[PDB]
Copies of this chain bind each other. A is one copy, B any other.
Amino acid sequence: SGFRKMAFPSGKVEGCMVQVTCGTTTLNGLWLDDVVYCPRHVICTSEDMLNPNYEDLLIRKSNHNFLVQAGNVQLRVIGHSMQNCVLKLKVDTANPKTPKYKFVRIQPGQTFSVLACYNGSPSGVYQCAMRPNFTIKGSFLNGSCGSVGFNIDYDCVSFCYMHHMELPTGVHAGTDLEGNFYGPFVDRQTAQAAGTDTTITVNVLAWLYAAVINGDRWFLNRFTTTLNDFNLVAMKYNYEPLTQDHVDILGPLSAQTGIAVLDMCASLKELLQNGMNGRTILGSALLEDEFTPFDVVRQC
């Protein structure tokens, strides 16, 4: 037993990371089949980032201006396309190590594993949630740009994220693998408001169930509540509204534990109104919202 924040094994992805250099800027690329994907701001200098005209800047670039290095293996670039905020560099060799893969655009509240890389070299793996306001709170130093987020189902890597920006607030923003930003963000070094974040209510509930399974039951109380009562409390406390879709997804966990969802909500309400009072749930002294129902089920 036991419960941990756990990333997917990164092996399949490590074999796809490349280094992409254009002019003076180095960052990470993702080589699948014969296409290398990377943040289009690889083409920018420091000053460029203040106010880039990506079309005009890219027009000053040809195929030979992109250095693609796979470990020590130089890749030959034979086409280049901008799609939203990604570059798609066509190279002459299919990646021998390409796994089965999909590109997916995930939803707020969903989670994924990040392989943080520098100079096309993996350095660490960890699990992130896409926040309701479409930021992530990661660990992304200078040159992490181009690191990707992914899920694995059996043999298939669903790439869902590529890192592009740290906001002045210190949170992180980026694209799907088609180059469309999550959230209102743009690939320019400018003031950008993320906007109010909220707790992923359904994740918190899933985590409470994981706590019950693991033997932490102190917070289980004598009350119940209704979706609407609970949702009123959710409002006050800056939590996402709970819907029937959410109740449904907790079904299997409510099934195992014999604790109906709305009884778990009344527990949550007591925690939101009374706090945790110096106690811990699954070793945490706040309410974790970084685990989906799927995450919890996988681990149980």
A residues contacting B by CB (< 8 A) are 1-11, 14-15, 115-116, 122-126, 137-141, 166, 170-172, 214-215, 275, 278, 280, 283-286, 298-300
Q: Which residues of B contact A140 (CB under 8 A)?
A: 1-2
Q: Which residues of B contact A171 (CB under 8 A)?
A: 2
One of B1, B8, B139, B280 near A166 (C-beta < 8 A): B1
Which residue from chain B places its CB closest to the CB of A295 in the assembled complex? B124
Q: Do residues B170 and A1 form an inter-chain contact, with CB atoms below 8 A? A: yes
The CA-CA distance from A213 to B15 in the complex, in Å, is 32
Q: Which residues of B contact A170 (CB under 8 A)?
A: 1-2, 214-215
> Which one of A9, A140, A298 has the greatest number of beta carbons of chain B within 10 Å?
A9
Check A2/B138 contact, CB under 8 A, given A14-B11, A285-B285.
Answer: yes
The CA-CA distance from A1 to B137 in the complex, in Å, is 10
Check A124/B9 contact, CB under 8 A, given A170-B215, A283-B137, A285-B286.
Answer: yes
The CA-CA distance from A10 to B284 in the complex, in Å, is 26
The CA-CA distance from A7 to B115 in the complex, in Å, is 10
Q: In the complex, how many angstroms separate the beta carbon of A253 from the nearest chain B beta carbon?
A: 16
Q: In the complex, how many angstroms separate the beta carbon of A297 from the nearest chain B beta carbon?
A: 12
The CA-CA distance from A15 to B126 in the complex, in Å, is 20
The CA-CA distance from A280 to B285 in the complex, in Å, is 10
Q: In the complex, how many angstroms separate the beta carbon of A197 from the nearest chain B beta carbon?
A: 12
One of B4, B123, B137 near A138 (C-beta < 8 A): B4
Q: Do residues B2 and A139 form an inter-chain contact, with CB atoms below 8 A? A: yes
The CA-CA distance from A284 to B170 in the complex, in Å, is 16
Closest 6 CB pairs of A and B: A6-B124, A11-B11, A9-B122, A285-B285, A4-B139, A11-B14
Q: In the complex, how many angstroms separate the beta carbon of A122 from the nearest chain B beta carbon?
A: 4
Q: Do residues B2 and A126 form an inter-chain contact, with CB atoms below 8 A? A: no
Check A123/B286 contact, CB under 8 A, given A1-B170, A170-B1.
Answer: no
Which residue from chain B places its CB closest to the CB of A115 in the assembled complex? B9
Q: Which residues of B contact A115 (CB under 8 A)?
A: 9
Q: Do residues A15 and B11 form an inter-chain contact, with CB atoms below 8 A? A: yes
The CA-CA distance from A285 to B275 in the complex, in Å, is 12
One of B2, B116, B286 near A172 (C-beta < 8 A): B2
What are 6 A-B residue pairs whose CB atoms fall within 8 Å in the complex? Answer: A1-B166, A2-B166, A5-B126, A8-B124, A11-B14, A275-B278
Q: Do residues B3 and A139 form an inter-chain contact, with CB atoms below 8 A? A: yes
> Which one of A166, A215, A286 has the greatest number of beta carbons of chain B within 10 Å?
A286
Q: Do residues A7 and B139 form an inter-chain contact, with CB atoms below 8 A? A: no
Q: Do residues A125 and B14 form an inter-chain contact, with CB atoms below 8 A? A: no
